[PDB]
C-alpha cells in the first residue's frame, strides 16, 4: 500500500507522492498480476480432472499397502501420514510487525480443497489407471494395472504375476524407507524452506529499509516535519521518498523475477503430473532414475512431492554373442 509504506500517516507526504505521478498505480497493477498467476499455478497444477472421485472403502489392493498415502480417517483433514510429516517439517511477532501496509492474501484453494484434489488424483489412479485422464474412467483390478505397466518397459508381463508377493514386499519396504529417510535428513524439504525463507527475508529487508537515513537527517517523517520548517524540509523528505521509492521498485522487480522462476517450475510440475501420473512416460530421466512405472502426487506447503517409482536391473551375468 504505497501511501502507507512510502509516506507516513502524515497528510503532507501524500501530496508530494501524488506529484510524482502514477508510480504506485503501476506497482499495484504489477503485484496483482503476480497474485493471479499464483492462483492459476495451483489451479492448473492440481485440477486437471474436474470429477472428484472418492477413495474405495477397502484397502486390499492385491497385497500392496497404500496406507501412508491414502487419506487418514482419524484426523478430520484427509491429510495422510506422509503429508502429515511434510506439513510439520515445513513449519510455515514479525507478522504483527507488518503494520506498514504489507499483507499476505490467502490462497483461493484452501488446504482442504487441495487435499481433496490430491486425494482424487491418487484415488483414481489406483483403481482406474491412465484412462481417467483421456476420457471416461474405467475400473481394472490393481495387480493388472501393473502388468500393463511392465509391458511398456520391454519386459513381458510374465514377471509381475509370477512373482506377485516379492514385488509387494519390496514396495512396502521401499515406502517405509522413504518415510524414514524423509523424516531423517534435515534438508530433505530444504529447497521448500528456501522458497519461504527467500520470501520472508525479502519482506524483512523491505521493512528494515525505512530505518535508513538515505542521506537525510532522520528516518522519522513526523519529527522531520516538526523540527524542520517546510521549504527546506521538502528537500530531505524528497530524499527519503526517492530512496524508499527505489527500494520498493527493487522489491517489485525481484518479485517479478522470482515469480517467473516459480512459473517455470509450475509448468514443469504440471507436465510431470500430466505425464508421470496420468500415463507411463518413456522420457529418460524424467519420471525417476530408471525405467519408469508410475507416480504418486502428494501435497506440501507451496509445492508438490512426487513418489517416482522405477525398475532397475540388479545382478548381471556376461556371455558370448553372435
Amino acid at each position: 500500500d504505497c501511501t502507507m509504506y512510502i509516506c507516513g500517516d502524515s497528510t503532507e507526504c501524500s501530496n508530494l507522492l501524488l506529484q510524482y505521478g502514477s508510480f504506485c498505480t503501476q506497482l499495484k497493477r504489477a503485484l496483482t498480476g503476480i497474485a493471479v498467476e499464483q492462483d492459476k499455478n495451483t489451479q492448473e497444477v492440481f485440477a486437471q480432472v474436474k470429477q472428484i472421485y472418492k477413495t474405495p472403502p477397502i484397502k486390499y489392493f492385491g497385497g500392496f499397502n497404500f496406507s501412508q498415502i491414502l487419506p487418514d480417517p482419524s484426523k478430520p483433514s484427509k491429510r495422510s501420514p506422509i503429508e502429515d510429516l511434510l506439513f510439520n517439517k515445513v513449519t510455515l511477532l514479525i507478522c504483527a510487525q507488518k503494520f506498514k501496509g504489507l499483507t499476505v492474501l490467502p490462497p483461493l484453494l484452501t488446504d482442504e480443497m487441495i487435499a481433496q484434489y490430491t486425494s482424487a488424483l491418487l484415488a483414481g489412479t489406483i483403481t482406474s489407471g491412465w484412462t481417467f485422464g483421456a476420457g471416461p474412467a474405467l475400473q481394472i483390478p490393481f495387480p493388472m494395472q501393473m502388468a500393463y505397466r511392465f509391458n511398456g518397459i520391454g519386459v513381458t508381463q510374465n514377471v509381475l504375476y509370477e512373482n506377485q508377493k516379492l514385488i509387494a514386499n519390496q514396495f512396502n519396504s521401499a515406502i517405509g524407507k522413504i518415510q524414514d529417510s524423509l523424516s531423517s535428513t534435515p534438508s530433505a524439504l530444504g529447497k521448500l524452506q528456501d522458497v519461504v525463507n527467500h520470501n520472508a527475508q525479502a519482506l524483512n529487508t523491505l521493512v528494515k529499509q525505512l530505518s535508513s537515513k538515505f542521506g537525510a537527517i532522520s528516518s522519522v517523517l513526523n519529527d522531520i516535519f516538526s523540527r524542520l520548517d517546510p521549504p527546506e524540509a521538502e528537500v530531505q523528505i524528497d530524499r527519503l521518498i526517492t530512496g524508499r521509492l527505489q527500494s520498493l521498485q527493487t522489491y517489485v522487480t525481484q518479485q517479478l523475477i522470482r515469480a517467473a522462476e516459480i512459473r517455470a517450475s509450475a509448468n514443469l510440475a504440471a507436465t510431470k503430473m500430466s505425464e508421470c501420473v496420468l500415463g507411463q512416460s518413456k522420457r529418460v530421466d524424467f519420471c525417476g532414475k530408471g525405467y519408469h512405472l508410475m507416480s504418486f502426487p502428494q501435497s506440501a506447503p507451496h509445492g508438490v512431492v512426487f513418489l517416482h517409482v522405477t525398475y532397475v536391473p540388479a545382478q548381471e551375468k556376461n556371455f558370448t554373442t553372435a
Binding site: 474436474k50 470429477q51 484434489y117 483414481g124 475400473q139 483390478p141
Partner: peptide, 14 residues
C-alpha cells in the same frame, strides 16, 4: 470442485 463420482472396484471387474 465437481460432482462426486464413485468408481467401483473388485478383484475381477473390467
Amino acid at each position: 470442485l465437481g460432482a462426486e463420482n464413485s468408481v467401483a472396484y473388485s478383484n475381477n471387474s473390467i
